[PDB]
A and B are shown apart, each in its own frame.
With several copies, the nearest count.
Chain A
Amino acid sequence: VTKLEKSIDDLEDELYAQKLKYKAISEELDHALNDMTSI
C-alpha cells in the first residue's frame, strides 16, 4: 500500500502539472486564433 500510494501521488501531481500546463496553451489558443481572424 505505501508503494502504490507513493506512485498515486506522483501520477496525480505530474498531473495537475499537465492539466494546468494546458489551460495555459488552450487559452493562449482561443487568443492566438482570435487575433488572426481579426488581423
Chain B
Amino acid sequence: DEDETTALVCDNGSGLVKAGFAGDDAPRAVFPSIVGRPRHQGVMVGMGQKDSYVGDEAQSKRGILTLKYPIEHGIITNWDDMEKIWHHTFYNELRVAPEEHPTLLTEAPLNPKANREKMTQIMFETFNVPAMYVAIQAVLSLYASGRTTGIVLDSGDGVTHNVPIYEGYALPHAIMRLDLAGRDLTDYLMKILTERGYSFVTTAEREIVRDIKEKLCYVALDFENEMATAASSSSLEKSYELPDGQVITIGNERFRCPETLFQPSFIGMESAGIHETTYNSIMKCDIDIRKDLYANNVMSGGTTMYPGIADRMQKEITALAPSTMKIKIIAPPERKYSVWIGGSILASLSTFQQMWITKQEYDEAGPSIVHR
C-alpha cells in the first residue's frame, strides 16, 4: 500500500495535463496546460496579489493575464513555467505532498535525452519525490490496449505521431511526427464556420467553436460522396444552440474539419496525412515485423475521437497495404486517456516496483540513471 495507493501518474500534454493515482480508472485531474501572468497590478475581491495563475484559473481570467504554453508540440520548452504546472498538480489539484509519493511521468516520442534528465533533476531535486519513472506516451497507450507490438497513431492538442513499438521498444528510426492536431483543427473549423456566414466575435463565441468540433464533428468515410450528399441536402445538417438562443447551423463543415487530418492541403500544409504517414512508418520498419504493425494500429489521443475515424483509416491503409495483409485499426472508447490509463496499470503493477528510479539511485548515479 506504501506505494500501491501512493503512485502518481502525470501525463503532461500540449493542451491538457491528465493526473491522478495509479490504480484509478481515469485521471483525477484534467486541466489546461497554461500559466498566466497578470498584465496589470490589482486584486480579486478577498484575495491577495497573485503572481501567477495555472490551469483553469488562467483560462477564466485570460483577459488580464499573458497566457503561456510550457509544452510546445509535446516537448517542454519552458522549465520555469513547467515546474509551476507540476506544483499546481501536486499541491492543489491532487492535494498530495509529493515527498512521499512515487511519480510516473510521461514524455514524448523523440524527447531529447537532456530533457528526460532535466525533469528528473526537478522531480528529485526541487519536489523531493521518493522515486519516479518516465514512460514514452505511445508506449503506454499500446500497453493499455493489452499489447506490446503494434503502431500507435497518437494525436492530441499540438502533435501527431506514429510510434511503431516491438516487444515494448519504440522504434526510433520509424517514428513520424506531424505538427497538426486538435488545436489546428479548432481554428480551421472556426474559419469554415465564419465562412458559412458567421461571427465568433466575443470570447464566449471563440471558446465554444471547440465544443462544436468535439460534439458535432465527424470523419466520414467516402468524404467524396459526402460533399455530394451535402448538396442534395439531406437531414445531414446539425444546429447547435449557443451560450444564448442564437441557434447556429452546421451541416456540411461538420466533416470538412476532420478531412483536414487526411488532407493537410485544406490548411496550407504540404506534409502527408495521417494514413499515409501510418503507412510510411510501416515501410520504414523491418520487413518481418510489418504484418504485426498492420494488424495493430492502436489509436490514442483527443483528436482521434472524431467518430468514423477508424473506418476511414481502416480503408485508407487496406488500400495502400499489399492484399496479402491483415489490417486492424483498434480505437478504444477511453482513448482520450489511453496514455494515462497505460501508466496507471503499469505503475500499479506488481512487477514495476523494480524499475522505479529511487533517490538512492539518483543521489548516487546523477540524472543519467533514469535517462537509460
A and B touch in the complex (CB under 8 A): yes
The stretch of B59-67, B175-183, B269-277, B325-333 that contacts the partner chain: B325-333
Which residues of chain B have a CB within 8 Å of any CB of chain A? Answer: 310-311, 326, 328, 330-334
> A20 to chain B: which residues have CB within 8 Å?
328
A27 near B328: Cβ-Cβ < 8 Å: no
Chain B residue with minimal CB distance to A33? B333
A34 near B334: Cβ-Cβ < 8 Å: yes
Interface residue A6 (Cβ < 8 Å from any Cβ of B): no
Main secondary structure on chain B at its contact with chain A?
loop
Contact pick for A30, options B326, B328, B332, CB 8 Å: B332
List the 10 closest pairs (A to B, CB-CB), nearest first. A30-B333, A31-B333, A34-B333, A16-B326, A27-B331, A30-B332, A27-B332, A23-B330, A27-B333, A20-B328
**Bound complex: CA of A20 vs CA of B294, how far in Å?**
13
**Bound complex: CA of A20 vs CA of B333, how far in Å?**
17
**Bound complex: CA of A11 vs CA of B61, how far in Å?**
62
Chain A residue with minimal CB distance to B305? A31
| Shortest Cβ distance from residue B24 to the other chain A in the assembled complex, whole angstroms | 16
**Bound complex: CA of A16 vs CA of B328, how far in Å?**
10
Chain A residue with minimal CB distance to B295? A16
Which residues of chain A have a CB within 8 Å of any CB of chain B? Answer: 16, 20, 23-24, 27, 30-31, 34
> B310 to chain A: which residues have CB within 8 Å?
24, 27
B328 near A23: Cβ-Cβ < 8 Å: yes
| Shortest Cβ distance from residue A34 to the other chain B in the assembled complex, whole angstroms | 5
Main secondary structure on chain A at its contact with chain B?
helix
**Bound complex: CA of A34 vs CA of B328, how far in Å?**
23
| Shortest Cβ distance from residue A21 to the other chain B in the assembled complex, whole angstroms | 11
**Bound complex: CA of A34 vs CA of B332, how far in Å?**
11
| Shortest Cβ distance from residue B30 to the other chain A in the assembled complex, whole angstroms | 14
**Bound complex: CA of A16 vs CA of B318, how far in Å?**
13
Chain B residue with minimal CB distance to A29? B333
| Shortest Cβ distance from residue A30 to the other chain B in the assembled complex, whole angstroms | 4
> B331 to chain A: which residues have CB within 8 Å?
27
> A31 to chain B: which residues have CB within 8 Å?
333
Chain A residue with minimal CB distance to B326? A16
Contact pick for B334, options A16, A23, A24, A30, CB 8 Å: A30
**Bound complex: CA of A23 vs CA of B332, how far in Å?**
10
- 13 pairs, A vs B, C-beta closer than 8 Å: A16-B326, A20-B328, A23-B328, A24-B310, A24-B311, A27-B330, A27-B332, A27-B333, A30-B332, A30-B333, A30-B334, A34-B333, A34-B334
Chain B residue with minimal CB distance to A30? B333
Chain B residue with minimal CB distance to A35? B333
> A27 to chain B: which residues have CB within 8 Å?
310, 330-333
**Bound complex: CA of A30 vs CA of B334, how far in Å?**
8
**Bound complex: CA of A16 vs CA of B333, how far in Å?**
22
| Shortest Cβ distance from residue A25 to the other chain B in the assembled complex, whole angstroms | 12
**Bound complex: CA of A22 vs CA of B218, how far in Å?**
21
> B330 to chain A: which residues have CB within 8 Å?
23, 27
**Bound complex: CA of A31 vs CA of B335, how far in Å?**
10
| Shortest Cβ distance from residue B3 to the other chain A in the assembled complex, whole angstroms | 30
> B332 to chain A: which residues have CB within 8 Å?
27, 30
> A16 to chain B: which residues have CB within 8 Å?
326
**Bound complex: CA of A30 vs CA of B326, how far in Å?**
24
**Bound complex: CA of A20 vs CA of B310, how far in Å?**
12
Chain B residue with minimal CB distance to A32? B333
| Shortest Cβ distance from residue A24 to the other chain B in the assembled complex, whole angstroms | 8
Chain A residue with minimal CB distance to B329? A23
| Shortest Cβ distance from residue A18 to the other chain B in the assembled complex, whole angstroms | 13
